[PDB]
């Protein structure tokens, strides 16, 4: 389970923190009132993570340690709220029996026994926290019929704790408290046990024939050298670094930093900037993405009497934008205008794409012209698009 | 001898033919693996210091925020939560403009229509529904609800295509599906994932009829929306694939997983080309998205933090604190000026 994977990683860290030679020093300090066994400070945890996990930012190491505490691997001995502080606050490791990876979804009947046992401690003078006392009142109302047996169960546990080693009893009482600090947290604290609803859930002759066709299909795939692939990724990204607002400050300013929306109005203007026109030259996809670039591209081709390829491509792209109710009649209109013999805007396909399209029109669909659009797209990419970028119209836009 | 059918004499001929094709592919894959991306990226200069901060805090949802999507106008945002409410914000001013309550809890998916006049959403209702957006006074969004998609398990992700007329859906029943919004008709079903499908992302090339998806089977799959077949699959994560996103050129895509790693796959190289991880990052990555140039990969993790990655060099350039619970969704602004994170702490934050 995915929730178990982060527990094992946290438990690996706890295993390294408990090493003899290079672990967290566990001390028995004394205060003005009492002696406190087997404790260590929060700054000890933060400095251990910085060194042994190589975390430069102390905020990141403190944040990682605060999630281990919240999940219940170490806990503050003086607070029901499980968090980590980068100071002298004293902490204590959780015993592996109370670990969240140990199949723990405790019931309210177990919490009622615990809360009932707590009110018996200290000669029945222990006072629960306000949220604990309010939890006990709800549990007493819920288990009102069987409360005599919850009391007997807690009274039986208290007799074991009474005849128990004083130092082990002190440590285990806080560890049992830290267990319930995870599964019944303080109101306002994140319940680390809440989980995502998605995650809360023949002969050996045909076998070889199934293999051979499988591997042959894999060999038919066209792959590239990592050098060529890395070169194209490096050059494509470097091309747009000047356009990336996270990397280069926008002109005039980033609206989220300056509260000035003039950058958005310039991006939406019908008069394009020089960087916007320069971007059209990166490739035909950039010219077609930009609505102004699409208008100027089409405006140029119509001025050279060669727009039939682009207007067909634009017609097919609109076809795939129509509801399926409209596509059968629209397929016939595209066929009559661009492909049928004697068409007003006749385009020239290869015989393979024209034959396939003629049969696809017999049964219209959203992908009737895909084989043809694919051909026309590559044709413009090598003919109509270089004509637009090299036109005086584009050059006069590129030079302002 | 003089008898014996000798079936194994021909089975060994087929075994020696299947072994050779497999070794043929292994040797070809090794031959193409001449360098590593981060080794070539040593030619690139390292990035400067980043000072990204929270610029807006969207407070209003009553429970865990589970998804969000930017509007094409670069400022409006749709967001959904566990309590069933979907909210449309003007994030630049943080004003709530629209809101609809759904008949289910855990509305795990929401999307913004390309026109900006509709939204789609769904979750434990095992459906995906389209709601219109209007400037109507006392607008009743629920009365215009258009039920489009329909699965046998929960809806995990959804997305309009290049128009308001079709939506992609990913479901916990192991299928992705393309739908006609106006009629509710199933245009294509995508079977292949061995477990729940958790995410999907449409190909950046509006010329491309492909999309990628990730699931609990640790796989990411590229689909052909015309045939319905999976044309390419990747399995290198050690746990669930929670989010997928295409690199801006469309020749690559990234993924975030519960194994606390983010990985970059290149479709031309047909292999994983980068792994984004660190010893101190042990919680799963729930969402990933690229900056405009693809140099930066933003990722939201269950450790409540956001880690920004240099896509080319692999090093982590920033870690961002602020959310007080898991980061469930993260998307970069349509113009790349900001990115928005949604969290289980009931809030969304816009960073820049």
XYZ file of C-alpha atoms in Angstrom:
752
model
C 0.000 0.000 0.000
C 1.259 3.516 -0.827
C 0.634 4.827 2.715
C 2.929 2.026 3.997
C 5.781 3.137 1.711
C 6.347 6.421 3.547
C 6.128 4.644 6.914
C 8.993 2.307 5.999
C 11.052 5.318 4.901
C 10.339 7.129 8.173
C 11.073 3.917 10.086
C 14.392 3.571 8.260
C 15.321 7.059 9.496
C 14.312 6.163 13.062
C 16.504 3.069 12.715
C 19.479 5.275 11.806
C 18.664 7.754 14.595
C 18.915 4.895 17.121
C 22.415 3.822 16.064
C 25.025 3.484 18.794
C 27.955 5.241 17.116
C 26.221 7.869 14.942
C 22.777 8.174 16.519
C 20.815 10.640 18.617
C 22.093 10.744 22.236
C 19.309 9.675 24.601
C 19.752 11.174 28.072
C 18.091 11.125 31.497
C 17.853 14.782 32.514
C 16.628 16.151 35.839
C 14.477 19.205 36.505
C 13.579 21.089 39.680
C 10.629 18.764 40.408
C 11.422 15.346 38.923
C 13.786 13.221 36.842
C 12.834 12.598 33.212
C 14.210 9.404 31.612
C 15.145 8.563 28.037
C 14.680 11.947 26.364
C 16.359 14.083 23.719
C 15.923 17.655 22.543
C 14.279 18.917 19.377
C 17.470 20.631 18.228
C 19.139 17.209 18.421
C 16.629 15.845 15.900
C 16.960 18.862 13.597
C 20.767 18.736 13.587
C 20.765 14.967 13.029
C 18.606 15.334 9.908
C 20.744 18.191 8.558
C 23.938 16.142 8.849
C 22.866 12.578 8.034
C 20.359 13.437 5.271
C 22.426 16.372 3.912
C 19.703 19.013 4.239
C 21.069 22.530 3.806
C 17.959 24.539 4.714
C 17.165 24.003 8.425
C 13.516 24.841 7.707
C 13.347 21.791 5.432
C 14.944 19.520 8.041
C 12.667 20.896 10.766
C 9.696 20.323 8.456
C 10.708 16.721 7.753
C 11.132 16.033 11.465
C 7.795 17.671 12.259
C 6.041 15.184 9.951
C 7.731 12.217 11.633
C 6.494 13.535 14.983
C 2.986 14.147 13.631
C 2.873 10.558 12.349
C 3.953 9.294 15.773
C 7.597 8.223 15.649
C 8.833 10.656 18.280
C 6.705 12.895 20.451
C 7.008 15.844 22.849
C 6.778 14.654 26.450
C 4.962 17.861 27.458
C 2.331 18.319 24.730
C -0.545 16.404 23.155
C 0.134 18.276 19.887
C 2.702 16.292 17.889
C 5.170 18.690 16.271
C 8.902 19.400 16.228
C 10.657 22.567 17.388
C 14.284 23.532 16.749
C 15.035 24.219 20.404
C 15.467 22.536 23.807
C 12.011 20.939 23.970
C 12.346 17.335 25.138
C 11.192 14.444 22.955
C 10.961 10.676 23.264
C 11.030 7.882 20.701
C 7.902 5.817 20.094
C 8.165 2.073 20.628
C 7.678 0.031 17.420
C 4.552 -1.593 18.890
C 2.651 1.713 18.564
C 3.965 2.447 15.061
C 1.370 3.450 12.434
C 2.626 0.677 10.119
C 1.620 -1.980 12.694
C -1.990 -2.406 11.452
C -3.650 0.221 13.637
C -7.200 1.480 13.149
C -8.262 1.535 16.807
C -11.935 1.519 17.735
C -13.820 3.900 20.006
C -14.322 1.016 22.444
C -10.531 0.887 22.836
C -10.335 4.664 23.279
C -13.064 4.508 25.934
C -11.045 1.945 27.906
C -7.969 4.174 27.627
C -9.759 7.357 28.715
C -11.435 5.417 31.533
C -8.069 4.027 32.664
C -6.592 7.539 32.628
C -9.153 8.919 35.095
C -8.118 6.181 37.558
C -4.411 7.079 37.537
C -2.840 9.310 40.200
C -5.246 7.982 42.851
C -8.158 8.853 40.528
C -7.096 12.526 40.629
C -5.839 12.772 37.039
C -7.775 15.336 35.004
C -8.075 14.726 31.275
C -7.628 17.505 28.761
C -10.809 19.361 27.839
C -11.015 17.599 24.473
C -10.323 14.251 26.156
C -13.037 14.853 28.761
C -15.497 15.811 26.021
C -14.546 12.637 24.142
C -15.202 10.564 27.270
C -18.644 12.141 27.681
C -19.590 11.132 24.131
C -18.216 7.611 24.618
C -20.107 7.230 27.902
C -23.286 8.202 26.048
C -22.538 5.873 23.125
C -21.500 2.816 25.179
C -23.959 3.514 28.006
C -25.278 -0.065 28.047
C -21.852 -1.761 28.168
C -20.034 0.816 30.305
C -19.692 -1.502 33.311
C -17.494 -3.774 31.172
C -15.416 -0.912 29.766
C -14.752 0.143 33.365
C -13.835 -3.419 34.368
C -11.549 -3.666 31.333
C -9.763 -0.411 32.191
C -9.632 -1.368 35.875
C -7.949 -4.619 34.827
C -5.357 -2.734 32.768
C -4.657 -0.358 35.666
C -3.784 -3.273 37.958
C -1.099 -4.347 35.476
C 0.288 -0.799 35.306
C 0.339 -0.612 39.119
C 2.539 -3.725 39.401
C 4.924 -2.485 36.732
C 8.449 -1.058 36.755
C 8.269 2.610 37.742
C 10.597 3.808 34.975
C 9.042 1.587 32.297
C 5.586 2.674 33.472
C 6.599 6.324 33.070
C 7.888 5.771 29.525
C 5.015 3.544 28.381
C 2.347 5.896 29.761
C 3.669 8.696 27.541
C 4.066 6.314 24.593
C 0.457 5.157 24.937
C -0.537 8.828 25.150
C 1.445 9.565 21.983
C -0.313 6.684 20.216
C -3.704 8.274 20.911
C -2.276 11.685 19.993
C -2.043 10.240 16.461
C -5.369 8.413 16.152
C -7.438 10.849 18.270
C -5.538 14.104 17.676
C -6.040 17.439 19.395
C -8.859 19.396 17.688
C -7.306 21.553 14.987
C -4.420 19.168 14.272
C -4.118 17.259 11.008
C -5.245 13.638 11.387
C -2.334 11.813 9.736
C -4.392 8.588 9.595
C -6.907 10.040 7.117
C -6.349 8.491 3.690
C -7.318 9.413 0.142
C -10.621 7.909 -0.984
C -8.864 6.683 -4.141
C -6.310 4.689 -2.122
C -8.785 3.465 0.543
C -9.394 0.129 -1.176
C -2.864 -24.000 -23.634
C 0.100 -25.565 -25.462
C 3.517 -23.985 -25.268
C 3.456 -23.516 -29.012
C 1.008 -20.590 -29.128
C 2.796 -19.002 -26.148
C 6.011 -18.659 -28.154
C 3.954 -17.309 -31.064
C 2.527 -14.652 -28.737
C 6.084 -13.665 -27.769
C 7.531 -13.370 -31.283
C 4.854 -10.938 -32.474
C 5.252 -8.973 -29.226
C 8.997 -8.349 -29.569
C 8.812 -7.668 -33.319
C 6.332 -4.839 -32.704
C 8.799 -3.308 -30.239
C 11.602 -3.383 -32.827
C 9.411 -1.598 -35.391
C 9.313 1.508 -33.176
C 11.513 4.370 -34.371
C 13.801 5.566 -31.571
C 16.456 8.271 -31.314
C 19.903 8.535 -29.779
C 19.986 10.059 -26.310
C 22.451 12.618 -27.697
C 19.956 13.786 -30.328
C 17.094 13.680 -27.811
C 19.073 15.646 -25.220
C 20.167 18.167 -27.862
C 16.579 18.847 -28.961
C 15.326 19.243 -25.380
C 18.166 21.626 -24.496
C 17.618 23.784 -27.588
C 13.808 23.812 -27.339
C 13.926 25.004 -23.719
C 16.657 27.601 -24.334
C 14.444 28.963 -27.126
C 11.635 29.892 -24.707
C 13.699 30.913 -21.658
C 13.256 34.568 -22.651
C 9.484 33.910 -22.702
C 9.308 32.049 -19.366
C 8.078 34.487 -16.674
C 9.638 32.332 -13.945
C 13.024 32.808 -15.660
C 12.811 36.237 -17.344
C 10.752 39.173 -16.014
C 7.762 39.971 -18.240
C 7.342 43.303 -20.001
C 6.401 45.520 -18.244
C 5.866 43.453 -15.082
C 4.474 40.190 -13.758
C 0.850 41.031 -12.822
C 1.017 38.727 -9.780
C 4.017 40.667 -8.400
C 3.073 44.250 -9.340
C -0.762 44.086 -9.445
C -0.423 45.705 -12.895
C -2.450 43.916 -15.577
C -0.935 45.755 -18.561
C 1.028 42.599 -19.416
C -2.231 40.684 -19.918
C -3.705 43.432 -22.114
C -0.583 43.501 -24.299
C -0.669 39.706 -24.649
C -4.310 39.992 -25.775
C -3.842 43.000 -28.075
C -4.467 42.722 -31.808
C -1.198 44.571 -32.477
C 1.510 42.018 -31.611
C 4.822 42.771 -29.957
C 8.154 42.004 -31.607
C 8.751 39.045 -29.283
C 5.275 37.760 -30.183
C 6.009 37.983 -33.918
C 9.478 36.499 -33.370
C 7.765 33.550 -31.672
C 5.788 32.795 -34.851
C 9.149 32.039 -36.522
C 9.925 29.236 -34.057
C 7.660 26.891 -36.025
C 4.265 26.569 -37.628
C 2.676 25.396 -34.362
C 3.508 28.765 -32.792
C 1.967 30.652 -35.719
C -1.204 28.538 -35.553
C -1.448 28.751 -31.749
C -1.421 32.554 -31.838
C -4.797 33.817 -33.136
C -3.103 36.910 -34.579
C -0.392 34.700 -36.057
C -3.116 32.526 -37.568
C -4.812 35.565 -39.122
C -1.580 36.953 -40.586
C -0.546 33.513 -41.857
C -3.906 33.123 -43.607
C -3.864 36.744 -44.805
C -0.500 36.201 -46.503
C -1.472 32.943 -48.221
C -4.634 34.536 -49.620
C -2.467 37.363 -50.986
C -0.290 34.783 -52.786
C -3.362 32.807 -53.971
C -2.305 29.649 -52.114
C -4.513 29.443 -48.995
C -6.334 26.238 -50.009
C -4.034 24.043 -47.905
C -4.447 26.091 -44.717
C -8.197 26.622 -45.144
C -8.647 22.855 -45.485
C -6.544 22.246 -42.367
C -8.570 24.869 -40.486
C -11.799 23.240 -41.692
C -10.799 19.798 -40.394
C -9.708 21.214 -37.026
C -13.122 22.855 -36.698
C -14.757 19.542 -37.637
C -13.167 17.891 -34.591
C -14.564 20.777 -32.501
C -18.195 20.165 -33.569
C -20.731 18.052 -31.665
C -21.161 14.556 -33.091
C -24.646 15.594 -34.261
C -23.156 18.037 -36.792
C -20.169 16.048 -38.095
C -21.895 13.913 -40.802
C -23.178 16.928 -42.750
C -19.976 18.891 -42.103
C -17.840 16.041 -43.477
C -19.735 16.254 -46.776
C -19.262 20.033 -46.943
C -15.495 19.708 -46.453
C -15.380 16.974 -49.103
C -17.365 19.041 -51.614
C -15.358 22.229 -51.058
C -11.810 20.823 -51.008
C -11.597 17.238 -52.289
C -14.487 16.307 -54.595
C -13.793 16.572 -58.347
C -14.516 20.107 -59.473
C -14.132 21.608 -56.013
C -13.964 25.383 -55.433
C -10.893 25.144 -53.179
C -9.386 21.940 -54.558
C -6.329 20.668 -52.696
C -3.881 18.103 -54.082
C -3.418 14.922 -52.042
C -1.313 11.887 -52.761
C -3.230 8.978 -54.266
C -2.990 6.996 -51.017
C -4.568 9.715 -48.864
C -7.210 10.543 -51.481
C -8.325 6.919 -51.869
C -8.508 6.428 -48.094
C -10.476 9.665 -47.650
C -12.898 8.778 -50.464
C -13.751 5.572 -48.591
C -13.866 7.331 -45.206
C -16.409 9.883 -46.471
C -18.729 6.945 -47.249
C -18.996 6.541 -43.447
C -18.404 9.994 -41.941
C -16.795 10.532 -38.556
C -14.639 12.964 -36.623
C -11.411 11.447 -38.026
C -12.463 11.187 -41.683
C -9.770 13.622 -42.875
C -6.922 12.669 -40.515
C -4.820 10.954 -43.189
C -5.350 13.954 -45.481
C -4.828 16.611 -42.797
C -1.611 14.838 -41.791
C -0.361 15.166 -45.377
C -1.447 18.797 -45.797
C 0.099 19.735 -42.437
C 3.537 18.428 -43.433
C 3.104 20.107 -46.826
C 2.515 23.549 -45.297
C 5.276 22.900 -42.746
C 7.726 22.700 -45.669
C 6.101 25.077 -48.182
C 3.343 27.471 -47.104
C 4.888 28.221 -43.701
C 8.417 29.090 -44.956
C 6.706 31.332 -47.521
C 4.956 33.263 -44.739
C 8.064 33.692 -42.575
C 10.023 34.958 -45.600
C 7.304 37.364 -46.783
C 7.677 41.133 -46.606
C 4.462 41.150 -44.558
C 6.076 39.123 -41.767
C 9.406 40.965 -42.009
C 7.600 44.296 -41.610
C 5.895 42.944 -38.481
C 9.153 41.472 -37.149
C 10.926 44.862 -37.401
C 9.222 47.545 -35.310
C 15.620 -42.431 -32.817
C 13.346 -43.499 -35.668
C 10.140 -42.234 -34.022
C 9.228 -39.414 -31.650
C 7.122 -36.424 -32.664
C 9.886 -33.956 -31.665
C 7.669 -31.022 -30.754
C 10.441 -29.456 -28.657
C 12.693 -29.465 -31.736
C 10.311 -26.862 -33.191
C 9.576 -25.201 -29.838
C 13.313 -24.611 -29.433
C 13.257 -23.036 -32.904
C 10.523 -20.650 -31.743
C 12.304 -20.022 -28.436
C 15.538 -19.191 -30.278
C 13.481 -16.800 -32.435
C 11.790 -15.038 -29.506
C 15.054 -14.816 -27.552
C 16.868 -13.251 -30.513
C 14.244 -10.542 -31.068
C 14.372 -9.699 -27.355
C 18.170 -9.533 -27.423
C 17.941 -7.526 -30.643
C 15.856 -4.925 -28.797
C 18.098 -4.939 -25.714
C 21.182 -4.289 -27.850
C 19.447 -1.558 -29.861
C 18.252 0.185 -26.689
C 21.777 0.094 -25.254
C 23.267 1.386 -28.518
C 20.979 4.436 -28.439
C 21.805 5.149 -24.768
C 25.022 7.029 -25.478
C 24.635 9.833 -22.881
C 22.478 10.964 -19.963
C 20.373 14.124 -20.124
C 21.905 15.758 -17.039
C 25.385 15.009 -18.410
C 24.591 16.860 -21.641
C 22.888 19.581 -19.578
C 26.250 20.390 -17.959
C 26.652 22.597 -21.041
C 23.693 24.652 -19.750
C 24.293 27.344 -17.134
C 22.673 26.863 -13.736
C 19.641 28.893 -12.701
C 19.774 31.834 -10.318
C 18.185 32.271 -6.920
C 14.389 32.015 -6.818
C 12.219 34.167 -4.549
C 8.742 32.762 -5.183
C 6.080 33.631 -2.606
C 2.348 33.238 -2.121
C 0.516 36.088 -3.852
C -3.111 35.004 -3.310
C -4.816 32.726 -0.789
C -8.186 31.311 -1.874
C -10.199 30.630 1.288
C -13.772 29.392 1.003
C -13.909 25.624 0.577
C -15.267 23.739 3.572
C -13.076 20.641 3.215
C -10.038 19.253 1.364
C -9.369 20.900 -1.982
C -8.935 18.049 -4.467
C -8.498 19.628 -7.919
C -8.225 22.937 -9.747
C -7.884 24.209 -13.301
C -6.915 27.582 -14.754
C -9.110 29.480 -17.196
C -7.738 30.610 -20.548
C -8.077 34.265 -19.457
C -5.048 33.626 -17.137
C -6.813 34.711 -13.906
C -9.983 32.671 -13.326
C -9.793 29.336 -11.499
C -12.214 26.450 -10.918
C -11.698 24.320 -7.805
C -13.484 21.368 -6.217
C -13.470 19.984 -2.686
C -14.432 16.899 -0.694
C -17.611 18.469 0.732
C -19.012 18.482 -2.821
C -18.704 22.190 -3.647
C -17.124 23.531 -6.841
C -16.081 27.197 -6.898
C -15.028 29.528 -9.723
C -12.686 32.294 -8.555
C -11.300 35.465 -10.062
C -7.967 34.635 -8.445
C -6.410 38.017 -9.277
C -8.977 39.658 -6.975
C -9.861 36.428 -5.063
C -13.576 37.066 -5.685
C -15.846 34.022 -5.903
C -17.851 34.250 -9.133
C -19.644 30.887 -9.373
C -20.392 27.983 -7.055
C -22.292 24.701 -7.362
C -22.880 21.887 -4.869
C -22.712 18.340 -6.208
C -24.791 15.322 -5.113
C -21.609 13.456 -4.122
C -18.593 13.896 -1.874
C -14.926 13.810 -2.913
C -15.276 15.815 -6.119
C -11.816 14.675 -7.211
C -11.882 16.165 -10.727
C -12.760 19.526 -12.261
C -11.845 21.288 -15.489
C -12.359 24.598 -17.287
C -13.871 24.668 -20.766
C -11.664 26.176 -23.506
C -14.226 28.935 -24.102
C -14.345 29.813 -20.403
C -18.147 29.443 -20.412
C -18.463 25.997 -18.807
C -16.854 23.637 -16.307
C -16.843 19.868 -15.872
C -16.563 18.031 -12.565
C -17.286 14.764 -10.809
C -16.085 12.281 -8.248
C -17.727 9.591 -6.123
C -20.895 9.991 -8.223
C -19.072 7.886 -10.875
C -19.957 10.546 -13.460
C -18.652 13.718 -15.068
C -21.084 16.609 -15.510
C -20.796 19.886 -17.433
C -22.106 23.103 -15.877
C -22.513 26.359 -17.830
C -21.199 29.696 -16.562
C -23.389 32.789 -17.017
C -23.643 36.367 -15.807
C -27.096 35.624 -14.478
C -28.364 37.164 -11.265
C -28.899 34.591 -8.498
C -27.566 32.055 -10.997
C -28.789 28.482 -10.471
C -25.976 26.357 -11.897
C -27.366 22.998 -10.748
C -30.518 23.406 -12.862
C -28.398 23.445 -16.049
C -26.342 20.351 -15.171
C -25.456 18.268 -18.241
C -24.649 14.646 -17.381
C -22.012 13.509 -19.882
C -19.710 10.745 -18.640
C -20.668 7.612 -16.720
C -18.358 4.992 -15.194
C -18.678 1.981 -12.901
C -16.310 3.489 -10.311
C -15.210 6.939 -9.165
C -14.052 9.710 -11.490
C -10.388 10.533 -10.867
C -9.607 13.068 -13.605
C -11.313 14.918 -16.435
C -10.422 17.396 -19.164
C -12.051 19.156 -22.088
C -10.374 18.713 -25.455
C -9.600 21.709 -27.664
C -13.322 22.605 -27.588
C -16.303 22.626 -25.226
C -17.876 19.683 -27.078
C -15.766 16.747 -25.833
C -14.330 15.703 -22.469
C -11.808 13.051 -21.484
C -12.429 11.141 -18.264
C -10.286 8.836 -16.140
C -11.974 6.478 -13.700
C -11.171 4.037 -10.918
C -12.706 1.256 -13.018
C -9.459 1.141 -15.017
C -10.722 2.977 -18.114
C -10.382 6.328 -19.835
C -13.197 7.542 -22.060
C -13.880 10.280 -24.604
C -17.393 11.728 -24.580
C -19.622 13.968 -26.669
C -20.796 16.671 -24.263
C -23.913 17.727 -26.181
C -25.324 14.192 -26.443
C -23.553 12.226 -23.709
C -22.357 9.738 -26.320
C -19.293 7.559 -25.758
C -16.847 8.435 -28.544
C -14.031 6.081 -27.472
C -13.083 3.873 -24.523
C -9.457 3.296 -23.509
C -8.859 -0.101 -21.888
C -5.398 -1.155 -20.759
C -4.626 -0.092 -17.198
C -4.506 -2.959 -14.717
C -5.876 -0.888 -11.827
C -7.426 2.506 -11.088
C -6.567 5.320 -13.488
C -5.597 8.375 -11.456
C -4.741 11.128 -13.950
C -4.534 12.186 -17.585
C -3.059 14.976 -19.695
C -3.871 15.919 -23.280
C -1.093 16.265 -25.834
C 0.091 19.886 -26.234
C 0.060 19.704 -30.031
C -3.557 20.565 -30.834
C -2.783 18.609 -34.020
C -2.203 15.495 -31.911
C -5.049 13.123 -31.078
C -3.144 11.533 -28.191
C -3.105 11.737 -24.408
C -1.212 10.171 -21.511
C -2.573 8.626 -18.317
C -1.250 7.151 -15.093
C -2.598 4.594 -12.680
C -2.102 2.375 -9.636
C -0.382 -0.246 -11.828
C 2.757 1.981 -11.754
C 2.348 2.560 -15.510
C 1.992 5.612 -17.725
C 0.277 5.013 -21.064
C 0.026 7.084 -24.251
C -3.225 6.555 -26.156
C -4.454 7.095 -29.712
C -7.824 8.837 -29.400
C -8.826 7.633 -32.903
C -8.153 3.873 -32.509
C -8.478 3.685 -28.719
C -5.239 1.692 -28.496
C -2.248 2.287 -26.232
C 0.647 3.149 -28.556
C 3.342 3.494 -25.862
C 3.689 2.578 -22.188
C 6.243 3.244 -19.451
C 6.709 1.440 -16.122
C 9.603 2.616 -13.934
C 7.882 4.003 -10.817
C 7.792 1.808 -7.712
C 4.289 2.960 -6.697
C 1.143 4.681 -7.973
C 1.430 7.294 -10.721
C -0.557 10.208 -9.292
C -0.046 12.843 -12.009
C 1.143 13.103 -15.612
C 1.926 16.203 -17.640
C 3.314 16.744 -21.128
C 6.537 18.628 -21.709
C 5.608 21.766 -23.711
C 6.986 20.372 -26.993
C 4.808 17.256 -26.735
C 7.783 14.929 -27.289
C 8.086 14.171 -23.557
C 6.050 13.999 -20.364
C 6.669 13.976 -16.615
C 5.013 11.993 -13.843
C 4.704 12.158 -10.069
C 4.365 9.092 -7.883
C 3.894 7.867 -4.318
C 7.519 6.656 -4.419
C 8.504 10.310 -3.717
C 10.004 10.670 -7.213
C 9.222 12.600 -10.371
C 10.412 11.174 -13.685
C 10.709 12.488 -17.239
C 9.969 10.152 -20.156
C 10.815 11.048 -23.760
C 8.619 9.503 -26.446
C 11.343 9.598 -29.111
C 13.969 7.937 -26.904
C 11.340 5.455 -25.617
C 12.820 5.444 -22.111
C 12.868 7.401 -18.876
C 15.458 10.166 -19.265
C 15.480 11.805 -15.817
C 14.596 11.140 -12.176
C 13.853 14.034 -9.806
C 14.340 12.942 -6.195
C 16.238 13.672 -2.994
C 17.090 11.807 0.195
C 14.999 14.238 2.281
C 11.910 13.860 0.044
C 10.089 10.709 1.180
C 6.416 11.634 0.680
C 4.595 10.977 -2.560
C 4.214 13.530 -5.335
C 0.549 14.251 -6.053
C 0.759 16.719 -8.956
C 3.320 18.023 -11.457
C 3.353 20.754 -14.099
C 5.916 22.512 -16.281
C 6.883 26.131 -16.660
C 6.355 27.703 -20.079
C 9.809 26.785 -21.408
C 9.829 23.355 -19.755
C 12.973 24.249 -17.796
C 11.129 24.020 -14.458
C 8.970 21.210 -13.076
C 6.715 22.152 -10.164
C 5.568 19.294 -7.936
C 3.243 19.180 -4.933
C 3.898 16.485 -2.351
C 2.090 14.904 0.587
C 4.762 16.432 2.859
C 2.733 19.694 2.500
C 5.562 21.230 0.416
C 6.253 22.116 -3.213
C 9.558 21.250 -4.896
C 10.705 22.984 -8.089
C 13.052 20.985 -10.318
C 15.501 21.976 -13.040
C 14.186 19.673 -15.768
C 17.428 19.665 -17.758
C 20.023 19.580 -14.959
C 17.937 17.564 -12.474
C 18.812 19.639 -9.404
C 16.121 21.029 -7.107
C 16.052 24.827 -7.361
C 13.449 25.585 -4.672
C 11.220 24.168 -1.950
C 8.122 26.158 -0.985
C 6.354 26.020 2.384
C 2.924 27.354 3.278
C 0.240 24.682 3.114
C -0.642 22.974 6.398
C -1.776 19.694 4.807
C -1.158 17.686 1.636
C -0.806 19.466 -1.698
C -3.402 17.698 -3.851
C -3.283 19.695 -7.105
C -0.809 22.003 -8.836
C -1.106 23.746 -12.209
C 0.935 26.456 -13.925
C -0.894 29.549 -15.236
C -1.792 29.454 -18.960
C 0.717 32.275 -19.566
C 3.271 30.829 -17.124
C 3.338 33.896 -14.865
C 2.183 31.957 -11.787
C 1.171 28.539 -10.517
C -1.685 27.532 -8.222
C -1.588 24.810 -5.566
C -4.621 23.258 -3.887
C -4.332 21.539 -0.534
C -6.160 19.349 1.966
C -5.921 22.358 4.321
C -9.073 23.670 2.515
C -7.211 26.459 0.667
C -5.541 27.270 -2.633
C -2.455 29.448 -3.064
C -1.171 31.334 -6.111
C 2.622 31.609 -6.243
C 4.946 33.777 -8.333
